[PDB]
Design a protein around this ligand. Structure first.
Ligand SMILES: Nc1ncnc2c1ncn2[C@@H]1O[C@H](CSCC[C@H](N)C(=O)O)[C@@H](O)[C@H]1O
Ligand SMILES: Nc1ncnc2c1ncn2[C@@H]1O[C@H](CSCC[C@H](N)C(=O)O)[C@@H](O)[C@H]1O
Ligand SMILES: [Mg+2]
Ligand SMILES: [Mg+2]
Lengths: 344, 340
C-alpha cells in the first residue's frame, strides 16, 4: 500500500494547476468523482480534494468557498450504500478525518456523455473506471463478423480483427467522454485521470488485465464447457467489456479532442492488486485472485449464465490460482496510466 | 383523482412567480424536490416543472437553459429504486431532458451552496417531525403521552410540545431554504393540515393515526406480546399544522414573501375500487398506515408483532367501514412563497 502516498502526489500536482478565483468572496467550488462506487475510496479522495483546495485558499489569506462534491456512476451503482457512508455536515461556529465540510450529491448516468450543465465543474476526478467499455463492441457480438471472439471470453488471447474492434470502442468512448468533460469544465479548471493500461504495442497483450481475465478466468470458462452446464457458442457469446490502453491509444484521443492541455502524462508500475496477508500461503493466493474477478465483473457472468453456475466458475478460478500460485505473485503486475489535464 | 388537475394549477401559478434570466443565454436552471421518495410522483412533478419553465422561455423566444433536478430525502430513502426509474437523457412523456442528482440529508438544515437554487418544491413531507419531541419521550415530563401512541387523543402539554417541534423544524427549514434560493426564485409548499384551532384535533391525521391504529395498539396490550409502558414509549412523530401555525413561522423568518396561502379539502387518501365493499375499506386504510410509518413500529416492536397490529387495524377499519368513507378527510395547506 506504500504507493498511494506517491499517487496522492500526482493528484496534488494537478490540484495546483487549477485557476482559483482571486476575489475576496470566491463562488462555490465544484468537484466530481467520475466512476465512484459505494466504497470509502470515493469519499476519501473527495475529502482530499476539498482539503487541498481549501489549504490553497488559506495560503492566499482567503476564506475557502463553499464546496459541492458530485459522486457519479451508472444508475446501477449502490448509491444507497454510498449515501450512508457520507459523514454529517459541520455544525456551528467540540469540533476537533471524521467529519464533512462540503455539500454532496450522487449523479446517475454514464460519463461517456453529458452529466452536467456547461462550464460548471472546477475539477473532474476519475480513477480505474475509464478502462470499462461503454459496451461490448457490436462487431465482436456478431457471429458472422471476423471480430467475433470465438473461444476466448476476452481479447488478451488473440485476434487482430477482435483487438482492433476493442481499441476503436475505447477511443470512441474516451472521445465522447472528453468532449463531454470539455463542455462541463470551468475556464480555469483541470482533470485528473487514472486508468489501467499496458506497455505492449499490440492490443493482444493486455498486460495486467490480460493476466486477470485471460488465464484462470477463461480456463474456468473452459472447464464449464469441458463439462456440461455450459455450451460452446455460449462462452463465445460472453465478452468482458474491458480495454487497457497504451500511451499511444490514450494520448491520440487527447490531441484529437484538443480542448484539454496535457500538463503531465505517465505510465508506471503500480502492480499487484491482491491483498495477501500470508504471502507463502498457496490458498490465499487463490481466493484473493478469485475475489478480484468477482468484484470486477461477477454481475455479468450471472446475467449470461446461472447464479449457481457462476459460483462453480468463480470456484474453479480460485482453485486454478492456488495451483499456479507461484506464477501469479510474480507475474501479476498492473500498469497504470495517469493524465493530468487542464482546460485551455 | 380529479383534484390533481386543480393542484397542478397552484404549482403553475408559483412557477410564474420566478424571475427568469432575460439574457439570450440564461445560466443553468436548478429545481429541487424536497422529500422525494422512490415512486413516480417525484419524477412527474420535476418533469412538469422543467416543462413549464421551458414553455415560458419559448414564450419570450429564448432557448431554454440547461436544467438540473435535485431529488432530496433522508439517507434511508431508496435512491437505488429512484435512480432506476429516471428516464434516460435525450440523444442527438417517456423521455428526460434535464440532468439529475440525488441528495442525501435532512432538509431541516442546509443541503446546497448559498444562492444556487431557482425553485424548491416539497409535497407531503413538512408534516414529519425531525424527531419526537424530547419532552414527550421523558417519562417524568407532563408531555409524556401515556396510553395514546399519538396527539389526536388529548393533552395540552403534549400537544403544545409537538407544535413547538413543528415550528422549530419548519423554522430551521425556512432558514436553510432562504440561504439557498436565487434572488428571483420561489418555493411551492404542500403538506397536510387541519382547521381545528386546538392541536388536540389533528383532522385527517387524527383519524388516520388516532382511531383504529392506536386501538390495535390497545389490543396488543389487552393481550400479551406488548407491555403498557411500551405503547406509551411509542410516538408517531407527525404534526398537522393549522394556518396560524404555518403562517406564523413564515413571517418570523421574513425572507420569503407570501404570494399565496391556502387551506382546502383534498380529502380521502384511499384508493377504493369497490366503494360498498366493507373489506376493501379495511386493507386500504391499513395499507396507508403501513406505507406511512410501518418501519417505526418494527424498530420498536417485533416484525411479526407488527404484522399482527397492522392486521388488527385492517380488521377494525372494515368493522366500522361506514364511519370511514364519510369521516376520513384530509385538509391540505399549500404555500406559494417567493424570495424578497
Ligand atoms: N460509463 C460509466 N459511467 C459512470 N461510471 C462508470 C461507467 N463505467 C464504469 N463506471 C464505474 O466505474 C467504477 C469502476 S471501479 C472504480 C472504483 C473507484 N473509482 C476507485 O478508485 O476505487 C465502477 O463503480 C463502475 O460502475
Ligand atoms: N427531514 C427530512 N429530510 C428529507 N426528507 C424527509 C425528511 N422528513 C421526511 N422526509 C421524506 O419525505 C417523504 C414524505 S412522503 C412524500 C412523497 C412525495 N413527496 C410525494 O409527493 O408523493 C418521505 O420520503 C421522507 O423520507
Ligand atoms: Mg468470447
Ligand atoms: Mg405514547
Amino acid at each position: 500500500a506504500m504507493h498511494a502516498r506517491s499517487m496522492l502526489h500526482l493528484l496534488e500536482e494537478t490540484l495546483e494547476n487549477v485557476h482559483l478565483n482571486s476575489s475576496a468572496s470566491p463562488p462555490p467550488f465544484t468537484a466530481v468523482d467520475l466512476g465512484c462506487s459505494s466504497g470509502a475510496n470515493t469519499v476519501h479522495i473527495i475529502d482530499f480534494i476539498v482539503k487541498h483546495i481549501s489549504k490553497r485558499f488559506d495560503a492566499a489569506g482567503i476564506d475557502p468557498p463553499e464546496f459541492t462534491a458530485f459522486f457519479s456512476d451508472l444508475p446501477s451503482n449502490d448509491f444507497n450504500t454510498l449515501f450512508q457512508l457520507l459523514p454529517p455536515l459541520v455544525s456551528n461556529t467540540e469540533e476537533c478525518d471524521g467529519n464533512r465540510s462540503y455539500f454532496v450529491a450522487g449523479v446517475p448516468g454514464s460519463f461517456y456523455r453529458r452529466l452536467f450543465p456547461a462550464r460548471t465543474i472546477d475539477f473532474f476526478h476519475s480513477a480505474f473506471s475509464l478502462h470499462w467499455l461503454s459496451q461490448v463492441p457490436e462487431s465482436v457480438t456478431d457471429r458472422r463478423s471476423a471480430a467475433y471472439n470465438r473461444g476466448r471470453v476476452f481479447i488478451h488471447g488473440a485476434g487482430e480483427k477482435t483487438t482492433t474492434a476493442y481499441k476503436r470502442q475505447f477511443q470512441a468512448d474516451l472521445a465522447e467522454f472528453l468532449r463531454a468533460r470539455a463542455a462541463e469544465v470551468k475556464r480555469g479548471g483541470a482533470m485528473f485521470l487514472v486508468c489501467l493500461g499496458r506497455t505492449s504495442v499490440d492490443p493482444t497483450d493486455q498486460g495486467g488485465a490480460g493476466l486477470l481475465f485471460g488465464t484462470h478466468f477463461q480456463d474456468a470458462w473452459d472447464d464449464l464447457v469441458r463439462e456440461g452446464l455450459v455450451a460452446a457458442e455460449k462462452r463465445d457469446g460472453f465478452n468482458i467489456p474491458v480495454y487497457a490502453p497504451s500511451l499511444q491509444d490514450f494520448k491520440e484521443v487527447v490531441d484529437a479532442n484538443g480542448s484539454f492541455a496535457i500538463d503531465k502524462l505517465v505510465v508506471y508500475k503500480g502492480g499487484s492488486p491482491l491483498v495477501v496477508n500470508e504471502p507463502d500461503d498457496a490458498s490465499e493466493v487463490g481466493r484473493a485472485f478469485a475475489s478480484s474477478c468477482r468484484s470486477v465483473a461477477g454481475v455479468l457472468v450471472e446475467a449470461h449464465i446461472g447464479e449457481e453456475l457462476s459460483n462453480k466458475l468463480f470456484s474453479r478460478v480460485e482453485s486454478r490460482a492456488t495451483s499456479h500460485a507461484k506464477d501469479v505473485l510474480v507475474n501479476l503486475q498492473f500498469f497504470h496510466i495517469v493524465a493530468s489535464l487542464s482546460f485551455t
